[PDB]
Short mmCIF file of C-alpha atoms in Angstrom, two decimals:
data_model
loop_
_atom_site.label_atom_id
_atom_site.label_comp_id
_atom_site.label_asym_id
_atom_site.label_seq_id
_atom_site.Cartn_x
_atom_site.Cartn_y
_atom_site.Cartn_z
CA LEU A 1 -28.16 51.41 166.85
CA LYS A 2 -27.08 53.68 163.93
CA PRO A 3 -30.39 55.54 162.07
CA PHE A 4 -31.30 54.53 159.41
CA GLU A 5 -30.53 50.17 159.97
CA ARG A 6 -32.35 47.23 160.73
CA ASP A 7 -31.44 44.57 162.76
CA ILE A 8 -32.81 41.70 160.53
CA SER A 9 -30.22 38.79 161.41
CA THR A 10 -32.82 37.37 164.16
CA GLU A 11 -30.10 35.31 166.76
CA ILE A 12 -30.18 34.14 170.67
CA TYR A 13 -29.55 37.45 172.44
CA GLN A 14 -26.57 36.83 175.30
CA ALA A 15 -25.61 38.78 178.45
CA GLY A 16 -22.15 39.20 177.26
CA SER A 17 -19.36 36.82 178.36
CA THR A 18 -21.61 34.75 179.15
CA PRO A 19 -22.65 32.03 175.80
CA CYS A 20 -26.14 30.12 175.95
CA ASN A 21 -28.02 28.47 172.89
CA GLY A 22 -32.01 27.29 172.68
CA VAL A 23 -35.25 29.39 173.33
CA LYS A 24 -34.58 30.44 176.55
CA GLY A 25 -31.73 30.92 178.80
CA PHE A 26 -30.61 32.54 181.99
CA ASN A 27 -29.20 36.21 181.61
CA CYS A 28 -30.62 35.65 177.99
CA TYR A 29 -34.11 37.02 176.59
CA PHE A 30 -35.79 36.89 173.46
CA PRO A 31 -34.98 40.65 171.36
CA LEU A 32 -38.46 40.27 169.92
CA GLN A 33 -41.91 41.32 171.22
CA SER A 34 -45.18 41.06 169.48
CA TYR A 35 -48.26 43.09 169.99
CA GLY A 36 -51.56 41.91 170.48
CA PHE A 37 -52.71 44.52 168.78
CA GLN A 38 -56.83 44.27 170.02
CA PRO A 39 -60.09 46.22 170.08
CA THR A 40 -60.30 46.34 173.98
CA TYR A 41 -56.94 48.29 174.07
CA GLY A 42 -57.30 51.65 174.93
CA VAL A 43 -55.26 54.91 173.63
CA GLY A 44 -51.77 54.64 173.13
CA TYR A 45 -51.72 50.93 172.93
CA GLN A 46 -53.81 51.92 169.70
CA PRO A 47 -51.71 50.19 166.94
CA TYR A 48 -50.72 53.39 164.39
CA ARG A 49 -49.98 53.40 160.95
CA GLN B 1 1.09 59.90 138.87
CA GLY B 2 -0.72 62.21 137.03
CA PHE B 3 -3.74 63.72 138.48
CA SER B 4 -7.30 61.76 139.93
CA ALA B 5 -10.95 63.51 138.59
CA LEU B 6 -13.04 60.98 139.86
CA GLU B 7 -16.53 61.16 138.86
CA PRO B 8 -20.01 59.98 140.23
CA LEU B 9 -21.51 57.15 138.56
CA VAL B 10 -23.87 55.15 140.85
CA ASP B 11 -25.04 56.68 144.01
CA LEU B 12 -27.67 54.79 145.05
CA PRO B 13 -28.06 53.81 148.61
CA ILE B 14 -28.54 50.47 150.10
CA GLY B 15 -28.02 50.80 153.69
CA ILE B 16 -25.59 48.00 154.76
CA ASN B 17 -23.21 48.34 158.01
CA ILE B 18 -20.57 46.99 155.89
CA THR B 19 -17.64 45.43 157.57
CA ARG B 20 -16.06 43.45 154.85
CA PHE B 21 -14.45 43.46 151.39
CA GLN B 22 -13.59 40.71 148.78
CA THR B 23 -13.22 40.96 144.89
CA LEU B 24 -14.01 38.56 142.23
CA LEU B 25 -10.24 37.79 139.86
CA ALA B 26 -13.02 35.82 138.01
CA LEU B 27 -9.91 33.19 136.21
CA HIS B 28 -9.91 30.74 134.75
CA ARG B 29 -8.10 28.38 132.55
CA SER B 30 -8.32 25.43 130.40
CA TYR B 31 -11.31 23.11 130.25
CA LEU B 32 -9.41 20.05 130.33
CA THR B 33 -8.72 20.50 133.74
CA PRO B 34 -11.34 21.42 136.40
CA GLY B 35 -8.77 23.04 138.74
CA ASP B 36 -11.71 25.02 140.49
CA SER B 37 -9.66 27.13 142.25
CA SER B 38 -7.28 24.53 143.79
CA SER B 39 -3.63 25.17 142.61
CA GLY B 40 -2.89 28.02 140.32
CA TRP B 41 -6.06 27.19 137.40
CA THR B 42 -5.55 31.33 136.74
CA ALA B 43 -3.67 31.74 133.14
CA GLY B 44 -3.66 35.51 133.47
CA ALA B 45 -0.91 37.77 135.29
CA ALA B 46 -2.86 41.29 136.09
CA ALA B 47 -3.14 43.08 139.34
CA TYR B 48 -5.61 45.15 141.57
CA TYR B 49 -5.05 47.36 144.32
CA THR C 1 -0.97 46.89 148.86
CA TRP C 2 -0.12 45.07 145.37
CA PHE C 3 -2.90 42.05 144.99
CA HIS C 4 -1.57 40.74 141.71
CA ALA C 5 -3.53 38.38 139.71
CA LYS C 6 -0.61 35.79 138.68
CA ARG C 7 -1.14 34.12 142.34
CA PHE C 8 -4.58 33.68 144.24
CA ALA C 9 -5.35 36.98 145.76
CA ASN C 10 -8.55 37.06 147.24
CA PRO C 11 -8.38 38.41 151.42
CA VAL C 12 -10.86 39.35 153.19
CA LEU C 13 -10.58 43.01 154.20
CA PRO C 14 -11.87 45.11 156.26
CA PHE C 15 -14.30 48.25 155.29
CA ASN C 16 -12.02 50.97 157.13
CA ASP C 17 -15.13 53.34 156.84
CA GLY C 18 -14.02 53.68 153.17
CA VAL C 19 -12.23 51.75 150.31
CA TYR C 20 -10.42 52.45 147.35
CA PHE C 21 -9.31 50.72 144.64
CA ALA C 22 -7.52 50.63 141.35
CA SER C 23 -6.25 47.73 138.62
CA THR C 24 -4.00 47.95 135.86
CA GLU C 25 -4.54 44.87 133.15
CA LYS C 26 -4.36 44.37 129.30
CA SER C 27 -8.15 42.51 129.50
CA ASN C 28 -10.91 42.27 131.59
CA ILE C 29 -9.84 39.88 134.23
CA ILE C 30 -11.53 41.71 137.71
CA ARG C 31 -15.04 41.72 137.24
CA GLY C 32 -16.52 41.02 141.33
CA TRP C 33 -16.59 43.60 143.59
CA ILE C 34 -18.35 41.48 146.27
CA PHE C 35 -19.30 43.24 149.93
CA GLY C 36 -21.02 42.54 153.06
CA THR C 37 -20.87 42.61 156.65
CA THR C 38 -20.16 38.42 157.00
CA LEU C 39 -20.78 37.28 153.64
CA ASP C 40 -23.61 35.06 154.77
CA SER C 41 -26.69 33.96 154.05
CA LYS C 42 -27.79 35.51 157.18
CA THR C 43 -26.55 38.72 156.90
CA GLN C 44 -27.34 40.40 154.08
CA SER C 45 -24.28 40.89 151.60
CA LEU C 46 -23.95 42.97 148.92
CA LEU C 47 -22.46 41.06 145.64
CA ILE C 48 -21.36 43.09 142.32
CA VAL C 49 -21.04 41.36 139.81
#
């Protein structure tokens, strides 16, 4: 990405030259990934504001 | 021809990677016929560049 | 490009790293300058009226 830009338009990712749909598919991984922040996390995994 | 002396009036950042550009003619005609920009319904002879 | 307002003249144009605009008119016909990456509800689209 160019600096100072946001990827707010959520969409199903494609590997290129391979259309895909739904929620899961081969060569199609969901762009988003959550953070299961818990106190059991150690350093580095600590969420920082 | 003359000359150009353009001056800034609004300089507020937004932060969007813009790819398109369109303008609104705001054309209108008689209220009797609701053309809705189908054919004619302009009643104007202005221009823009 | 001459975009006289007699006929329908509202073509979507690429935002080629900048843009210029001018308009001679004996009226206040032109009102809107909508922008946007795709002019859709999904992506953010700038609307100027």
